[PDB]
Amino acid sequence: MVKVKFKYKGEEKEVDTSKIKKVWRAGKAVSFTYDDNGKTGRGAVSEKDAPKELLDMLARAER
Numbered sequence: 001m002v003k004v005k006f007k008y009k010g011e012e013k014e015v016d017t018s019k020i021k022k023v024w025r026a027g028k029a030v031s032f033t034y035d036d037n038g039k040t041g042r043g044a045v046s047e048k049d050a051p052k053e054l055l056d057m058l059a060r061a062e063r
Contacts, residue, residue: 002053006043013043017053023061030058 002017015034022033031044047055 002051004043004045004051004054006045008041008043013041015041015043017051017057020054020057023054023058025058025062030054 003014004017004020005012005014007013015036019034019036020032021035021040024031026044028047029044030047030050032042034041034043
């Protein structure tokens with residue numbers, strides 16, 4: 001139940017931790033994919049502006 005507020009192509013968008021599928025570490029940036037209902041959607045934020053639940057998802061991913 002963590003909410004992520006991000007800018008996609010200059011448009012403010014927002015998606016919850018649960019809907020999140022993929023997370024990659026790209027320099028200072030966090031690059032990710034979610035399930036917007038049937039479809040998949042793309043987004044990114046700065047590691048600085050990221051919520052804790054997310055950062056934990058990332059650590060998990062590096063095994």
